[PDB]
Structures are given as C-alpha cells and as structure tokens.
C-alpha cells in the first residue's frame, strides 16, 4: 500500500502545476481522496476532498484555483493548481480519507515553492526516554469522541496514531493511548522512546470546516 | 378528519437517515399553516411551492419523509446539494417541490456517553438518484481485492454511527427532519387544506 506525488517544482507567482498522487493497494475511485499541505515550519492544512461518487470540497484558501480530480484507469489523483501564491509553498500530501476513522495512508509528499478550531498544549515539550509524556488538545464546542492523532517525525509524512478519540489505529505501538470526549483530548506516551521525538497534531473529524488540525506539539529531547 | 402529522411528527423515534421513512398521507384534511406557524421549526423552507398557499391547494397524495442527521448536514436536505448525506443517504431532486422542515432533537435523540442508534452511510461507491433509499450493508471494498463479508483493511461496514452526546456543539447535535413532498396524478385528491 503506497501514494507517490509528483509534480511538485519550483516557480514564480502566478504559475501552474499540476500534482499526480499514483495509488497502489487502494482504489483511488472507491474512497475519499484528500490532499493535505505543510508550509516549511507550519502545520498540517487540509486542501480538498474527492469522493468516490464525484463530489469534491475545498478549503477557502484554495477555492477557485485548484482541482482535484482523478483517473480510474491509472489509479491517480491529481491537484490543478492555478494562480499560484507565495502562500501555497508547501509540501503536498496524498491521504486515503476514512473519515471517522482518520486519514490512515499518506504518501511522502511533493514539494512545491513558490517564490519570487482546535488548540494543542503545550506547542513545545521536552522530554527524556522513558518520560511519561501527555499533550492535550482542546476543541471550540463539543465534538463527541471526533477526534484523531498523528505523529510526525523530521523529514516524513505524518502517520495516523489514533481515531475516534481513543482508538488505537492498528499496528501503532500499546505505549501511545489517547482520552477524552467533548472539548478536552490528550495523547499520552507511557515510556518515551528515542523514535517518539516527534511532532503530533491531533484532527476534529468530521469538522466544519472540512479538516480541521490543532497547530502541532513539538516533542523534543532534553 | 385531520391529517396524522402527528404520527409523523412526534414520534418517540426516527429512523436513521440511511433507512428514511417514508409516510403516505391521504384521505384528510391537512392544515399546513399550522406547522409553518409554529416556534418549534428551525428550517420550514418549501421549494416550487410557498408555504402559505398550501392551505390552498389539493393533491392526490402528500409524503412525510423524516430521519435524523446532524446540525451541520440540515443543509444538504435541498436541491442542488453535495455532501455525505446528499449523495449516499437521502437525495432531493435539483428542481424539487415541497418542503423540508427541521428541528433540533438534543434533548430527545442525544445520550449521556452517546446515542449511536442513529446511522448514515459513510461508505458508498456512486451518488444516490433523488429519492433512492439503499438500506443495504455489504462489506465495503476499497481496494483490489474482495472482501467476501469479512471486515479488515480496505473492507469497511458502510454505515457508522453519530455521536450524540448532549454537551456537543450545535452542528454535532441531532435534528430531525421531516420533508414533505405532494403527488398530483389523474385521479381524485384526496388531501385539500381545510375548508
Ligand atoms: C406534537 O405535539 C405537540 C404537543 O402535544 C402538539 O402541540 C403538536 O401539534 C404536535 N405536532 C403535530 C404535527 O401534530
């Protein structure tokens, strides 16, 4: 199971691209699509949404210049990405979208220069192995159990760790655990180990608007 | 004799959206005046049609179409709509007539902890046509390779239950609706506004 972009380069303001998201061992035309970008430095943006019957959404920032649509024949997403801004700088990530529970396959992302409401706490932790580690993730209004996490480490796509709140996304390691229902979250490492400096953002699901993230903890060493 | 709104409208439970229900109304006197003037109704919006000259109008038949689905998708119950709802549980026509009516149901359909009787089909391969219902629940492929009635990766039960919990914000909280639709065929009516 694997998403590979392309298409990602560097241009000027007011230049065109167009990104390919080609798709193995799920069906692009079967399930939500979503694209999701990371500033250098920022966090995670949800972009836009395909569905499996046709219908596609967008965030406000991307409206009336980008397109998602795909391919059936060559399993491929694709963004059209007009009128180009020095604010879309960014990586551009391919996701599967389960909705409720959590975007689970990321692709590793295609860079894209352009050049001439949910609270995490802290947004900076250090720690050491073998710490106890908590983040806690606060929400605007109630949102139930609507909520997943995600890691992050230097360099990678983030990784689904969490959904519906508590939910342990399988193969993710026993130590990571996840509480909470209605406006307080928190992700927990029971025994923080050298691979677990990371960034982690946690998502509302189902939100609105679409895709909503927390702003990221950085967890860091010493 | 007066039209069973009430059957429709104050029923203890709805149906989940996937499984709307559908009434048929006939063979009485239907005062649709006073839905439209009552505070309980958050949406009362009629499309092809104005509310306030219902009372004068007959038709064959009249249908109540009601369910749950959350504040945020009250929305997509219109024409022209797209969204989860619009497209794999209950689709209006683009050019529809009738009304559609809604209310916040919290104190009724919300639970301490979560109802999740409530459900919607999250999962679903095409958009519904206008008034389509698919109450089936084969195990959902979206990969390559066949599920055979076995839940696992990329095979996923297609429905999935709200959340209702009562300290959720509005949008997160249950409405019911009830849409009203009106049949007028070569054959007798059988539903007028009072006399
Ligand atoms: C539902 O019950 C209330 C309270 O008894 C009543 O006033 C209202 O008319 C009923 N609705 C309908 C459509 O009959």
């Given at each position: 199971?694997?998403?590979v972009?392309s298409g990602?380069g560097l ?19 079967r399930?939500y ?5 990371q500033?250098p430095?920022?966090?995670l ?9 046709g219908?596609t959404?967008?965030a406000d ?13 060559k399993?491929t997403?694709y963004?059209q ?12 990530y391919?996701?599967?979208d389960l909705?409720?529970?959590g975007?689970?396959?990321?692709g ?10 949910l ?5 900076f ?7 106890r580690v908590?983040?806690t993730c606060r929400?605007?209004?109630g ?10 480490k230097?360099?990678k ?6 959904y ?6 399988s193969?993710?390691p ?17 025994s923080?180990?050298?691979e677990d ?13 679409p895709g ?11 | 004799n ?9 029923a ?18 239907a ?5 439209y003037?009552?505070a309980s109704?958050s949406?009362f919006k009629?499309y ?12 064959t ?12 998708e ?5 024409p ?17 007539t009738?009304?559609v ?5 919290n104190n009724?359909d ?35 390779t066949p599920?055979?009635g076995?839940?696992?990766?990329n ?6 239950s ?12 249950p ?5 009203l639709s ?7 009516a ?6």
């Open positions: 199971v694997q998403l972009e990602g241009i000027q303001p007011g230049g065109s691209l167009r990104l390919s998201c080609a798709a193995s061992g799920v069906t692009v035309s399930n699509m979503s694209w999701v970008r500033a430095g920022k966090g943006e949800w972009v836009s949404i395909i569905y499996a019957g219908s959404f967008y920032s991307v409206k009336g210049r980008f397109t998602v649509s795909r391919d059936n024949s399993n997403l963004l990405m007009n009128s180009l801004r020095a604010e879309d700088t960014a990586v551009y391919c996701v599967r909705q409720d529970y975007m689970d396959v990321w590793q992302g295609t860079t894209v220069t352009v050049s001439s409401q609270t995490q706490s802290p947004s932790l250090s720690a050491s192995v073998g710490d908590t983040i929400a605007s209004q949102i139930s159990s609507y909520l997943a996490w995600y890691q992050q230097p360099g796509a983030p990784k689904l760790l969490i519906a709140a508590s939910t342990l996304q193969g993710v026993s130590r990571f655990s996840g509480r909470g229902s209605g406006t307080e979250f928190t992700l927990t490492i029971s923080l180990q050298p400096f990371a960034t982690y953002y946690c998502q509302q699901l189902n939100s609105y608007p909503t993230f927390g702003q990221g903890t950085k967890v860091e060493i010493k | 007066l039209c069973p709104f009430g059957e429709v409208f104050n203890t439970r709805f149906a989940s959206v996937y499984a709307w229900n559908r009434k048929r109304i006939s063979n009485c006197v005062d649709y005046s006073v839905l003037n009552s109704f949406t009629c092809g049609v104005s509310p306030t000259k219902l009372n004068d109008l007959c038709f038949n009249v249908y109540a179409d009601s369910f749950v689905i959350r504040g945020d009250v929305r997509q119950i219109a022209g709509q797209t969204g989860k709802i619009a497209d794999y549980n209950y689709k209006l026509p683009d050019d529809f009738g009304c009516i809604a209310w916040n149901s009724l919300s639970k301490v902890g979560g109802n999740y009787n409530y459900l919607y089909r999250l999962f679903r391969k095409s958009n519904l046509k206008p008034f389509e219902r698919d109450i089936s629940t084969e195990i959902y492929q979206a990969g390559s599920c055979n076995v839940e696992g990766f095979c996923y039960f297609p429905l999935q709200y959340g209702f919990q009562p300290t959720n914000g509005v949008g997160y909280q409405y019911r609706v009830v849409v009106f049949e007028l065929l070569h054959a007798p059988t539903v007028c506004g009072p006399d």
